[PDB]
Design a protein around this ligand. Structure first.
Ligand SMILES: O=C(Cc1ccc(F)c(Cl)c1)Nc1cncc2ccccc12
Ligand SMILES: O=C(Cc1ccc(F)c(Cl)c1)Nc1cncc2ccccc12
Ligand SMILES: [Cl-]
Lengths: 301, 305
């Protein structure tokens, strides 16, 4: 029993964190096999931040310009290439701590663990979700660039995020491990703004099922709703539309608790209308949207 | 920017998690040097659990009755002893992954990271506070016993908790690494209830400072209060008393944000007597009490491990 925001054990990722220095900039790199991955903006100066030409800047760099440090050992860079917004630094030593890994691109609503690092050293691990506006609400200070988001698949690490920047509102933007940004963001100091954030509806429903599995039932009601009537209501509270895929994904939780998805949807509609009335659900006074249906099944069952 | 419930990196502790099997029971052990620590209830059956004489049960056991598995390698037990509610299994191999460590007993209000394990394999890491009633509001399923709570201080792991049981209300109880239970709990199948919980006041103040550092200032007010007037209000709302030590520990955050501790107490006092009024602090509609002042400084300063 109990329900917590739980991150994956970070050990397999800690053994991959290195420090990458280029000129005056120092950020984090991910050392897998003989390659170190890091945000390409590490090669940027002050004048080359509003409108950098990364192909031009990287052509001017040599392998000896990159200083890679794995613990107290300096790694030798023997090659450099760019894949979208990520810089790949080929090194002369394969990481003996390289786990079984994959690079995966996630969709909004998906959750992942973040290993926040500074100077190639892990300082903390926390849980995030890719927001519907493609930002992540992280906890990052200057120097955190290159910190990675991941999930663990039994023995395998799926790297899904690399931190690149902080938007003016305090939210964070980054890329997958192939350097493709999540969202309409660019790695330039140009005026950028995240789209209006919305609640991940399927995750709220998954969390209401987790609450029922944990014995919280006060919010349940005798009502059901159509998927379309639910979406008309949800949208007015800035909740993401619930698709038929989301209803299907909620199926196992629906079968386990005996509460149909559209029946839980009516419970959620009532909660949006009434609020909590001084009550809590799983120790929370707000509807939590950073637990996917997969997280709930994994943690509860 | 941003504020998250953040656990310490769990790597140093993952290299210590092993699986301990005794008869039909399988739980987790902590392998440090040539010793494996685990809850002593691993030697219990159903009859034993109801009223156990652990000295008598352990005397009947031999080293070969304990099956310790570190990954895919079986470790051979060469000795067994009991220290309070923890069983110590001497093994023939020292853990090459043993970090710099200490066994520390924490106080209520102190926070620590929990590496939840099943079958000697880590499945998740979460941060939590030792409640004033000595329980932890954790997340544990059957098989999680022996999962450990820890803190990291520079390159030193301070082990502060080992999971033993789940109370009828869904909260958890366990011991320090010397087998001494936190709270009035016993490792026996009997009626046990946690005392009424209270809010960790110093932690709420630390979290209000974290909110100010993050730009959330609506709750700040022109007022200040005496420590005695604040404590009288705190007692009334099931909040722990704030000591002069707590005020001193909040000093650096007070200096950083320009808001004196007793000034933040007047804001907390109003928040209790009036509520949030539909507003949130750090995305929360409740006052959060599982961030100590050191956690807040560590996160809003970037300390690494
Ligand atoms: O924002 C930057 C650096 C940066 C600046 C401009 C730019 F266009 C790009 Cl691609 C990157 N990284 C930081 C990351 N996280 C939190 C941060 C808090 C404070 C300061 C910096 C943070
Ligand atoms: O604590 C026990 C076993 C046990 C029972 C009685 C007793 F006195 C002692 Cl010392 C140990 N179990 C469980 C612990 N934590 C989470 C659990 C979730 C689900 C199921 C079982 C869990
Ligand atoms: Cl998880």
């Amino acid at each position: 029993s109990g329900f917590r925001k739980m991150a994956f054990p970070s050990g397999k990722v800690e053994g991959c964190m290195v420090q990458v220095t280029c000129g005056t900039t120092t950020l984090n790199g991910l050392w897998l096999d003989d390659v170190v991955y890091c945000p390409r903006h590490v090669i940027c100066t002050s004048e080359d931040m509003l409108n950098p030409n990364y192909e031009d800047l990287l052509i001017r760099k040599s392998n000896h310009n990159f200083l890679v440090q794995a613990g107290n050992v300096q790694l030798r860079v023997i090659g450099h290439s760019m894949q979208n917004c990520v810089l790949k630094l080929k090194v002369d030593t394969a990481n003996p701590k390289t786990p079984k890994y994959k690079f995966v691109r996630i969709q909004p609503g998906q959750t992942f663990s973040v290993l926040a690092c500074y100077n190639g050293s892990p300082s903390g691990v926390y849980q995030c979700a890719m927001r519907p506006n493609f930002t992540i609400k992280g906890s990052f200070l200057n120097g955190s660039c290159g910190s990675v988001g991941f999930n663990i698949d039994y023995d395998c690490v799926s790297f899904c995020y690399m931190h690149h920047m902080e938007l003016p509102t305090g939210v964070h933007a980054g890329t997958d491990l192939e350097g493709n940004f999540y969202g309409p963001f660019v790695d330039r100091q140009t005026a950028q703004a995240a789209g209006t954030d919305t609640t991940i509806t399927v995750n709220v429903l998954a969390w209401l099922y987790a609450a029922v599995i944990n014995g919280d039932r006060w919010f349940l009601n005798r009502f059901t709703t159509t998927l379309n009537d639910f979406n008309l209501v949800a949208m007015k509270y800035n909740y993401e539309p619930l698709t038929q895929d989301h209803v299907d994904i909620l199926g196992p939780l629906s079968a386990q608790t005996g509460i149909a998805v559209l029946d839980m949807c009516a419970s959620l509609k009532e909660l949006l209308q009434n609020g909590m009335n001084g009550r809590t659900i799983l120790g929370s006074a707000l509807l939590e949207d950073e637990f996917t249906p997969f997280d709930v099944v994994r943690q509860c069952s």
